[PDB]
Amino acid sequence: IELKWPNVPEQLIKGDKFLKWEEGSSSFTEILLRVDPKGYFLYWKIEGKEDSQLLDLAYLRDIRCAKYAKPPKDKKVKDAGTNFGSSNIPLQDKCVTICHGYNYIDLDWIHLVAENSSVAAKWAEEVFSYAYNLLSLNKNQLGEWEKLYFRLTTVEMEKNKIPVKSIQKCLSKDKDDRTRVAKAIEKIGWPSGKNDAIEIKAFDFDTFFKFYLSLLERSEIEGIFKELSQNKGNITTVMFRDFLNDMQRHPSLHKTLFPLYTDSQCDALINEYESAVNKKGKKKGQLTKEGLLYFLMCEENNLTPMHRLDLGANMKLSLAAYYINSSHNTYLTGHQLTGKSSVEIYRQVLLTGCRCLELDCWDGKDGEPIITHGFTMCTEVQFKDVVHAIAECAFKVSEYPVILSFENHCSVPQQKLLAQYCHEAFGELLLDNPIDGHPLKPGVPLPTPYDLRKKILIKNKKILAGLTDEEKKKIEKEKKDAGTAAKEAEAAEEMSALVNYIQPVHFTTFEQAQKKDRHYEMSSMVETQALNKLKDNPEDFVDYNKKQLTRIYPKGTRVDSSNYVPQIYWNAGCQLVALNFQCFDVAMCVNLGVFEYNGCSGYLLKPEFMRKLDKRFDPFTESTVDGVVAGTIEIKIISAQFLSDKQISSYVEVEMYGLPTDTVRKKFKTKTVNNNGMDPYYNENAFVFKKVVLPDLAVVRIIVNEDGGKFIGHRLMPLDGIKPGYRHIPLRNESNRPLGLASVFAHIVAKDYVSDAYQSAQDARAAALCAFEDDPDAALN
Ligand SMILES: [Ca+2]
Numbered sequence: 001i002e003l004k005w006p007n008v009p010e011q012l013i014k015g016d017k018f019l020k021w022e023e024g025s026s027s028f029t030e031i032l033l034r035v036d037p038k039g040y041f042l043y044w045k046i047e048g049k050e051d052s053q054l055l056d057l058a059y060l061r062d063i064r065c066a067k068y069a070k071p072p073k074d075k076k077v078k079d080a081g082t083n084f085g086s087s088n089i090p091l092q093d094k095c096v097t098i099c100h101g102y103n104y105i106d107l108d109w110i111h112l113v114a115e116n117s118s119v120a121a122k123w124a125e126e127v128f129s130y131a132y133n134l135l136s137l138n139k140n141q142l143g144e145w146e147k148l149y150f151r152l153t154t155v156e157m158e159k160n161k162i163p164v165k166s167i168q169k170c171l172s173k174d175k176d177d178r179t180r181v182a183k184a185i186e187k188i189g190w191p192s193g194k195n196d197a198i199e200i201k202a203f204d205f206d207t208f209f210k211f212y213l214s215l216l217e218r219s220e221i222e223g224i225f226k227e228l229s230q231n232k233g234n235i236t237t238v239m240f241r242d243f244l245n246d247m248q249r250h251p252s253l254h255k256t257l258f259p260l261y262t263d264s265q266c267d268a269l270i271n272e273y274e275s276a277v278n279k280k281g282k283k284k285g286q287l288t289k290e291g292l293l294y295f296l297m298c299e300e301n302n303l304t305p306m307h308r309l310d311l312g313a314n315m316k317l318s319l320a321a322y323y324i325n326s327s328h329n330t331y332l333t334g335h336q337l338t339g340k341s342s343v344e345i346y347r348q349v350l351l352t353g354c355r356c357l358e359l360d361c362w363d364g365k366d367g368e369p370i371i372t373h374g375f376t377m378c379t380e381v382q383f384k385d386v387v388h389a390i391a392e393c394a395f396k397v398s399e400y401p402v403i404l405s406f407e408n409h410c411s412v413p414q415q416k417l418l419a420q421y422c423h424e425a426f427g428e429l430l431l432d433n434p435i436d437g438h439p440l441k442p443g444v445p446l447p448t449p450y451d452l453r454k455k456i457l458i459k460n461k462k463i464l465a466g467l468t469d470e471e472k473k474k475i476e477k478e479k480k481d482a483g484t485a486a487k488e489a490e491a492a493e494e495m496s497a498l499v500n501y502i503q504p505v506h507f508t509t510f511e512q513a514q515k516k517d518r519h520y521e522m523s524s525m526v527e528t529q530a531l532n533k534l535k536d537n538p539e540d541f542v543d544y545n546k547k548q549l550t551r552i553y554p555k556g557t558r559v560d561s562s563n564y565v566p567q568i569y570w571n572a573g574c575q576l577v578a579l580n581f582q583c584f585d586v587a588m589c590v591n592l593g594v595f596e597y598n599g600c601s602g603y604l605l606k607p608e609f610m611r612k613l614d615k616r617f618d619p620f621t622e623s624t625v626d627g628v629v630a631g632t633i634e635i636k637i638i639s640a641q642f643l644s645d646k647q648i649s650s651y652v653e654v655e656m657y658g659l660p661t662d663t664v665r666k667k668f669k670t671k672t673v674n675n676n677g678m679d680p681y682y683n684e685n686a687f688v689f690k691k692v693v694l695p696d697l698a699v700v701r702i703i704v705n706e707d708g709g710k711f712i713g714h715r716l717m718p719l720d721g722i723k724p725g726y727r728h729i730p731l732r733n734e735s736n737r738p739l740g741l742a743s744v745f746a747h748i749v750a751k752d753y754v755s756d757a758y759q760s761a762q763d764a765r766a767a768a769l770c771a772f773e774d775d776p777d778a779a780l781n
Pocket of ligand 1: 485
């Protein structure tokens with residue numbers, strides 16, 4: 001597993017000097033910029049003053065330097081920066097721009113100037129790597145608690161002392177919950193007062209964990225401990241092995257690829273855990289209550305299967321074998337018709353890992369091409385600027401190929417500039433000719449993502465009478481739902497010559513595509529088109545997608561930039577299922593959580609039975625698929641930790657997305673706990689997903705909400721490689737960045753299913769598609 005934890009060099013911990021300025025301002029400030037040893041926060045002291053400002057790197061979006069940073073325009077700021085550090089180097093080259101945001105749409109900015117270009121570059125490289133470090137982004141609750149510990153030990157610390165009010169501000173805003181913190185501190189034996197500070201020397205992380213035990217009443221652990229220990233007192237080495245090997249492990253998981261824990265191994269771990277927790281009383285091969293609870297919070301119990309999280313999938317199959325992360329009308333930050341168009345958005349969407357972007361290209365009124373949603377009140381941006389942005393961020397987070405979907409409406413003259421600008425901005429990254437071994441001829445499979453790393457492919461145009469009347473009308477409806485994409489400019493040679501493996505063609509019939517046998521010909525279908533084909537011949541659609549690429553996009557009537565649940569189209573094997581990244585609904589939340597895995601590359605390999613040429617498959621099946629083994633899943637939502645700093649009322653919800661017959665929404669919801677943002681104890685009877693026809697396509701999602709139905713957090717767990725047992729589940733926001741301490745504690749059952757044992761073809765299928773709606777019972781009408 002090639003993933004590593006952050007490694008912050010002494011230079012950054014000790015810190016470097018910068019000047020900080022703000023846009024639309026005459027003045028500035030010199031600061032000492034710093035990172036904590038674990039690499040979780042940027043922090044600096046605003047001079048001769050109280051405290052330290054902080055940026056939580058979990059929400060850092062990008063840090064940039066040199067040519068990609070924003071230099072100051074105000075005269076007297078410019079002056080400062082030139083004479084700051086070394087006067088040799090041009091100001092541009094000392095500049096560092098940081099953008100952050102709890103979500104990637106509403107951003108905040110930080111502008112800085114360093115002493116030379118190396119410092120700039122170093123912070124730029126280092127900080128980024130910390131923010132996008134996957135292990136840090138998937139750390140278990142003990143990790144987040146440590147994160148808090150490091151905040152208090154570096155940022156909040158004043159003269160080697162940790163103020164109590166800082167410990168309070170971090171954990172609560174409510175008065176009673178703050179007094180809970182007070183009393184908890186007192187139990188430990190620390191100073192308890194509003195105005196006290198704890199000496200650093202007394203403030204070790206192990207006692208800071210006893211603080212956790214004192215603060216929260218994790219009553220769950222009593223019964224868990226009694227289950228495993230029974231009347232035998234403490235959990236022996238042998239008991240704990242069986243616990244790890246039976247309950248905490250999937251019965252299907254391959255014994256030799258994933259070897260069982262051993263007596264000797266468990267001994268080592270019990271020792272680690274009892275050292276953190278017991279010290280004075282630790283015994284060789286004996287695990288106490290607090291030892292066990294520690295484990296359940298520690299990295300070894302992390303729900304994330306590192307093997308699936310790492311970039312470990314086979315990258316060496318045809319492109320058509322992959323689910324590819326896709327964006328629709330990338331340029332829009334908001335509403336479809338009144339919304340703003342952005343250059344920045346292209347950066348952000350790429351930085352999430354997204355691989356397929358869209359560029360609606362329109363003729364600009366001064367000779368220079370623009371991007372916008374044509375004939376609407378949306379704003380316009382410059383095409384030249386957009387492609388330079390694309391090139392900048394195309395391969396920061398993923399080495400694997402980007403596909404640019406072009407809606408071309410330009411004049412022949414302006415199209416020559418599109419082409420030229422692509423060459424200018426992309427230089428060597430632009431794939432303007434096929435590669436060896438994959439000529440554009442019939443029978444030849446597409447290249448592999450591995451073959452096409454650090455390349456950018458262009459999807460532009462290159463240079464059915466006889467129907468029934470209801471078909472004609474169904475087609476007219478498709479065409480208008482296509483919006484502006486329905487009619488495009490004809491291709492100019494200078495543009496057509498850049499297209500190769502991704503040639504969009506006007507899809508006709510399925511039999512047509514396999515007779516032509518042209519793996520490089522693809523089809524971009526508006527959702528209305530897709531649903532038609534999907535309902536008519538679903539199996540044929542699955543087979544089509546084994547060799548060729550299907551892109552799917554939102555119908556025009558979704559003016560709010562609403563999204564469909566992508567599992568509808570992934571079920572058919574559609575690779576480029578494009579979404580509106582500016583809208584954080586269920587669909588988008590699901591998308592971002594799914595594409596985290598596989599080193600967050602934007603690529604996920606389809607399940608095997610979907611790539612096998614000879615095998616027929618019906619995504620609308622309700623009985624089991626031959627070869628593929630069905631499963632049962634049981635989720636028992638027990639409690640939550642640190643949902644909020646205020647005393648909220650919350651409930652938890654659990655949904656599943658995948659095949660129609662496996663998709664469940666608005667069915668499972670816990671009792672509501674009132675007035676407790678800290679340790680609400682739901683204790684809900686398990687939620688059973690009895691028959692999961694096809695787990696490899698299925699994901700499960702835990703959602704936590706405030707009483708009024710306001711979003712608090714969520715977590716996504718694909719069934720392919722899910723870990724059962726008691727697990728801590730740290731919640732994430734909608735952009736799939738962590739909330740931090742906010743977590744859920746659940747018991748998971750994952751195993752193989754074992755049993756005891758009209759309507760029109762497409763009416764039945766259309767009915768199945770309601771499972772995906774936000775209101776499955778009512779939408780079924
Ligand atoms: Ca469009």
